[PDB]
Every structure is written in C-alpha cells, then in structure tokens.
Amino acid sequence: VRPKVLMRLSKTKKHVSRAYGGSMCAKCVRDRIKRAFLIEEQKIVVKVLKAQAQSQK
Amino acid sequence: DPGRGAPLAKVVFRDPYRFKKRTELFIAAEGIHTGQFVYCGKKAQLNIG
Amino acid sequence: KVVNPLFEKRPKNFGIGQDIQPKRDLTRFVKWPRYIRLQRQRAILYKRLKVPPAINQFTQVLDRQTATQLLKLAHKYRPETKQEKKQRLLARAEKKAAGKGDVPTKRPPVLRAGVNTVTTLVENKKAQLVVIAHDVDPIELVVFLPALCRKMGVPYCILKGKARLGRLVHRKTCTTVAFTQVNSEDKGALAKLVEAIRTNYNDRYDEIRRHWGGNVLGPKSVARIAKLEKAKAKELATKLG
Amino acid sequence: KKIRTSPTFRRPKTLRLRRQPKYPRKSAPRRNKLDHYAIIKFPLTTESAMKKIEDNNTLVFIVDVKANKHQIKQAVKKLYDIDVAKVNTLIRPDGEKKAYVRLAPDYDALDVANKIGII
RNA sequence: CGUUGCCCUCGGCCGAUCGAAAGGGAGUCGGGUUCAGAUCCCCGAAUCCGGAGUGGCGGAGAUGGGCGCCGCGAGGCGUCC
RNA sequence: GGGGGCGAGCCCCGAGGGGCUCUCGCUUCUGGCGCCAAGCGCCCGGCCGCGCGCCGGCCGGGCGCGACCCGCUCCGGGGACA
Ligand SMILES: [Mg+2]
Ligand SMILES: [Mg+2]
C-alpha cells in the first residue's frame, strides 16, 4: 500500500514475526545467521592458531 | 552512468570514526563483480579492483 | 567471594579496519576560524622572518625577580585614583575658611605615564628610570624610545605586559612608565634597581643594535635538515674515524 | 584541559537577552476595527436567500472580506444571541464576501429573521 | 505537574528562500435540490489528519506457579519467587 | 621523541637482560556484526553495620589510565617561479 497509508495500518500488517521482520527476506536472514556464525568460528580458530604460534616462538 | 562509456561501482566502506557506512562511486575496473571485496591503501594487495 | 563470575573484560582493538577509533583529542587538526588562524600564524612570521634589531630588542624583557621588585616599588607611587581626587579638593575647600588655608601644601611624587609625557621627560633628563611595555600594538609608538633613553643616559627596561604596566596607573594598558622622583625612604631601592637594569640594557646597547633575530625555521623543517645532516655525518665520520 | 573531540569549530552558543524596552514604541495598542458589527454588514433579502432561510434553516449575510468563518460564527452569535452550526463563505464577483450561516436545529431561521427585520 | 531562567550533556550536513491548478502529495461517496450553484446546499452513509491534559470507557500488559497452613470439598489466609 | 612488545637486522650481553636499526601501531577464504566502554585505578555525597572510621555493606556520583610525551605552520603538492 502507498507509503503514507502505513501510518494508519497496524504494526502486524507492516511487518512479520521474525528477526529482520519485513525489512529482509527469510532466505537472506538464515544465511546471515549461519554466515555470521561460520565467520566467527574461523576467527576463533585463527585466534587459537595465532596463540599456538606465540607459544611455539 | 548516462553519457559515460565506463560503468561505475557503488562501493561501501565503513567510516572509521563514526559508526556509519560511507559509500563511493569508483570507475569499474574490468572483472569487478557485485559481492566482491575491494581492498585499498598502502598495504593493499596487488589484485584487480 | 566478592567477585561476580559474569564480569568480563571486552577490550577494544583500535587497529586499522578494526573497532572504530576512540574520540581522541584533535586540537592540532582543528579547522580554526580565520581570526584565530591569522593571529596564530602572525606569530609564526615573526619567528620565521628576519626581524630587524630595533623590534627584536622588545623580546629581551625583564626577568621575574627584578620585575616583582619594580612593580613593588611602583605600588608606592601609583597615581591618585578617583574619589581620592575629590577628597583632596574637598578637604582643601573646608580648610580655606575654618582654620587657616595655606593653599599649595606640599605635593608628593608619582609615576608618569604615556609615551608623550615620558619622551618629553627623557629629552629633558627628568626621568631616573623608564619602564617600557614589550607588546605595544603598533610598535612604532615605542621603537625610538630605547635608543632615545640610552642617548640621554636614562636607565630603561622592557617589562612584560602593557596591561600589567597599565594596571599601575588605573587604565586598561599603558605603553610606558617613568619615575622622576622617589621618596627618601624608598630612594635606595630605586637606586639599587636602576644599576641592575642598566647593566642589562643600556650598558650593552651596541650588542642590542647588532642583534637581529627571527630566521628560525619550523621544527618540522629543522628536524628534516638535522636528519639530512646525520646522513651526511654518517656518510663521512664512521667510515674514516 | 578540555579537549577538542571534533575537528570543526562551530560558533559558541552565547547568552542572548529578552527585550526590556525603556519605552513602548507606539503609545497605546491599536483598537480593533473588525468588531461584531463591522464584520457583518447586512443581510441579503434576495429571493434565493429567503428560500435558503425558510427551507435550510440558515441566514444569508454579506460580511467583511477580511473575516474568517471563525470570526463570522462569533459575530453572529454575539449580535443575535443565537448559535451557529456552520459557516460557509464565498466571495461575490463584486467584492462582498457572502456567508451562508447554518443555524443549529434548536433555533428556527424564520423567527430570527423576523427579529432582525428581514422577511 | 506545568512553565520558564541558568549550568552541564548531545547534535554533521549543505544551504536563506523561490520554482509544477498536467510530476510527487493523507482523506468522500450515493440520492435529492436551483431560473442560474453543487463530490461544495439537504438527506444518508463514510473517512483522514491534528488534539484528547485531569486521561472518557472497556480490552491488552495480567494476573500463573510454588510452598505452608486451615477447610469434607468448592475454597480462605500466610509467605516465597 | 619515547613507551609496548610478538618478532627480524645490527651492537652490547652476565643468557637475566639492555641498547641501536627495522617493524607495527596489530584487520585478506565467505554479500555477517562492530558507535554512545568494558576492565582497572584513585576520590568524594548520603544511608546502614562494625565503631578508629578514607574498616565492611547499601545507594549515588566525580576524575585518571584504557586511548604514551612534546611541538610552530590541518595535511599533501608546487614556490619566489606561476
Ligand atoms: Mg503480518
Ligand atoms: Mg512551492
């Protein structure tokens, strides 16, 4: 509906019950999640490998 | 970009002083694609774009 | 125990491309208003440019201990304020028709103030000491004055602050000051001061005349030259010697 | 020891005072010249107006062109100790602002018309 | 509780302003009515925007669960989240 | 200019360490996140309990480091020629 109508509408009509509800598609959320997680794990792994390299040297 | 042979690229950085995502319009080097990372500065690596 | 398990560290790595930089002080890189920027880089020209000696001599100001002695001595001879002036007149008006009115009594000695009073009583050798402010705004007013004083043999000095010189008298600023006479009790202190001043200014005026003095470079420029000289030094010093 | 966080130097917000005028410029305030009387010039007694009065429960006035509907409403109320439902102005091709005034249903239009003079 | 005065605290913008009765731009429709007016008057159905303080009212927030007593039982109180 | 130190080149070294020189100011596998401070340190106002209260608790604040020090042109590029 035309944007200035949204003003009238109830919250539920304007969004959806999810993280990034009504701003982003479901597909690209669940990728974000697992990207964010799989990225963070590799940072932790690299941090561990760095710490092992410090202990070695 | 009208009246320009070349294509441009909207390239988004993060402003390193305010929490804010600045954006630029580079001239697209050939071989650029979307969802690529573009690195830039003195300690930038020598690849395209 | 008084150490909650939850309380962590969470340290921020202010690297490059890492966590956004902290709000550090930028006073050095501020874009200043044109007035500020101007008044700042005026002082830079006076350092950078080859300043001629008649203007330079106003850098050689009086030292701290001496200055506080001088201003102590003047405190005796601060000229009459308002109200005091009225009381001097009012008392005289009352005494004329009451209990014998002489008229002139005997007036005490005081400071003399602005350049024009001073120069007429350096020409005339009436002054014993001349205090000059270092920071008169269009210098010309006081440029000749130190050359003049030394010609008439009048002890002269350059105090800091045209303001603090002007606070002796009760005005905003004053260019100059001079003692024509001093009371017998305080005469010896003035005489002590006078000799100490003239050794530092009048009795080395030839050196003051010769002494040019700006021509200093920026520290950023200087540092580069010294680094270049250290490169030239290490090119031919550690090799042979 | 108060540091510049930002490289800008905006102007500092100074105190600025209210007026405390040593004398008033104009001696006394201008008396209003758009009163309950000056606002309502006279009633139309035109065939069309009379039909509007009898049937629709209105009155038809020529009004001063500077008037709001709010001012007209207040005026009519004051003059004819009446109460208005709604005011509905237009401007005649002539220069006189006409105002159809719908009177509230408790009151009749014919009765007030007889009171003011027109019929 | 408002209203204002001062003190601190925070604040990028981006150019004052003008520029469209065809661009953008919330929300009104059916019937009736005049010599000449009607999405504008009357009747009837609606609707948007702004206000709504003291909040005008309901409803949501929210009325669980535990333990301890007393009560045949429905339940009542005490106390814990 | 110093700090910092994972380290590399050199110098010293007593193998603990120190100095000079480099190096960073620490981020490159993914179309994520990333501000308004955690942490430590030192102070104070009120309230409560021990009572010696800069002892302990409850509530509420302030400053320092964190985020080195000093400086004279904001940074570059030209330039006594344009
Ligand atoms: Mg929905
Ligand atoms: Mg316009």
Number of helices of chain C: 10
The rounded distance between the terminal residues' Cα atoms of chain B is: 19 Å
Count interface residues per chain for the largest interface: C-D, 10 and 7 residues
Strand order in the sheet with the most strands of chain B: 1-2
Largest sheet of chain C: 4 strands, mixed
Helix content of chain C: 40-55%
> What is the gyration radius of chain B calculated from CA atoms?
12 Å
Q: Give me the secondary-structure category of chain B.
A: mainly beta
Give the tally of β-strands of chain C. Answer: 4
Q: Please compute the radius of gyration of chain C using only Cα atoms.
A: 29 Å
In terms of structural class, how would the helical and strand content of chain C be classed? alpha+beta
Number of helices of chain B: 0
PDB class: ribosome
Keywords: termination, eRF1, abce1
Entry title: Structure of a mammalian ribosomal termination complex with ABCE1, eRF1(AAQ), and the UAA stop codon
Chain A: eL34
Labels describing this entry:
part of a larger assembly, 4 chains, B: 49 residues, mainly beta, two-stranded antiparallel ribbon, C: 241 residues, alpha+beta, 4-stranded mixed beta sheet, 10 helices, 4 strands, 6% strand, binds magnesium ion, RNA-binding, ribosome, termination, eRF1
Fold and architecture overview:
Chain D: GO terms for molecular function: rRNA binding; structural constituent of ribosome. Chain D: It is found in: Cytoplasm; Nucleus. Chain D: The modification Phosphoserine is found at residue 6. This is part of a larger assembly, with chains A (57 residues), B (49 residues), C (241 residues) and D (119 residues). Chain A is an all-alpha fold. Chain A contains 3 helices and no strands. Chain A has helices at 3-6, 11-14, 26-56. Chain A is rod-shaped. Chain A starts with a helix and ends with a helix. Helices cover 0% and strands 20% of the residues of chain B. Chain B has strands at 8-12, 23-27. In chain B, strands 1-2 form a two-stranded antiparallel ribbon. The two termini of chain B are 19 Å apart. With 241 residues, chain C is an alpha+beta fold. Helices cover 45% and strands 6% of the residues of chain C. Chain C has a 4-stranded mixed sheet, sandwiched between helices. In chain C, helix 6 links the parallel strand 2 (129-133) and strand 3 (156-159). In chain C, helix 3 (64-76) runs antiparallel to helix 8 (184-200) and helix 5 (115-123) packs parallel to helix 6. The N and C termini of chain C lie far apart (68 Å). A 4-stranded antiparallel sheet of chain D has the order 1-2-4-3, with helices on both faces. In chain D, a hairpin with a 5-residue loop joins strand 3 and strand 4 (97-103). In chain D, 25% of the residues lie in helices and 21% in strands. Chains in contact: B-C, C-D. The structure holds magnesium ion (MG) (2 copies). One magnesium ion binds next to helix 2 of chain A. The structure holds 2 RNA strands.
